[PDB]
């Protein structure tokens, strides 16, 4: 079954219009090689070409408007995660539900990063009301936070643990590999950020009753 032009597109199911062999009529249809199907995938917008988490985490590495450097660092992080052995999940630190098995993370470094950030990200934030808990003390009350605020707090914890670690080697991969190693320690449950996540969750459970405190509902109603 030797293929030839007169039967290539017919037997291969490829569109001759897409290849320009038999273009359309521009004077009638307006196009020459077919119209892209709408709506377009989000990744085709030049301002949203990168993943939401990757693009968000990259600009957190940026300093002094050096986005090109932070973009190469994120490329080194995803390259390190792609060459590291599959992680060993810890039952004590259950990752976000619905995540893929550990065997799939290495070849999918973007999900490796996403699963890590979305797993240690807290679910609540502690806001304080000035002078409503007693003798000048504040009334701390938990509140939920959107995704961008959850990922931002998580990845900033990771960078805080990274900057405090000592130097290991030389070259252009120092900071990149040092961050990637912390991303792996998070998925394996042996990282230090898990303590900061549980520490803020305790404050939420220890103050879940302040949502209806008498002070928060008697500001100026005791004339």
């Amino acid at each position: 079954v030797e293929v030839t032009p007169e039967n290539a597109a017919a037997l291969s199911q490829l569109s001759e219009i897409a290849y320009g062999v038999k273009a359309a009529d521009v004077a009638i249809e307006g196009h020459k090689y077919g119209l892209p199907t709408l709506p377009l995938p989000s990744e085709l917008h030049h301002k949203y070409r990168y993943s939401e988490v990757v693009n968000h985490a990259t600009k957190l590495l940026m300093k002094d408007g050096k986005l090109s450097k932070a973009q190469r660092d994120m490329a080194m992080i995803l390259n390190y995660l792609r060459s590291s052995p599959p992680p060993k999940l810890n039952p004590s630190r259950p990752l976000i539900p619905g995540h893929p098995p550990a065997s799939h993370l290495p070849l999918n470094p973007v999900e490796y990063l996403t699963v890590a950030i979305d797993s240690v990200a807290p679910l609540i934030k502690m806001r304080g009301y000035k002078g409503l808990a007693g003798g000048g003390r504040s009334l701390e009350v938990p509140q939920p936070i959107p995704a961008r605020q959850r990922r931002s707090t998580a990845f900033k914890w990771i960078l805080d643990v990274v900057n405090k670690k000592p130097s290991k080697g030389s070259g252009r991969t120092m900071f990149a590999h040092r961050v990637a190693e912390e991303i792996v320690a998070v998925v394996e449950g042996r990282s230090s950020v898990w303590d900061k996540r549980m520490l803020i969750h305790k404050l939420g459970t220890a103050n879940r009753a302040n949502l209806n405190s008498p002070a928060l509902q008697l500001k100026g109603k005791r004339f």
């Binding site: 291969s12 199911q13 490829l14 599959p86 799939h104 070849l107 999918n108």
Partner: peptide, 25 residues
């Protein structure tokens, strides 16, 4: 020629099948 011979490489499907074929332990 490749589509007929089934040689057209697609990195997306290559990784998917490898992960679903239980070959990644």
């Amino acid at each position: 020629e490749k589509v007929v011979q089934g040689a057209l490489v697609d990195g997306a499907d290559v990784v998917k099948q490898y992960l679903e074929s239980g070959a990644a332990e």
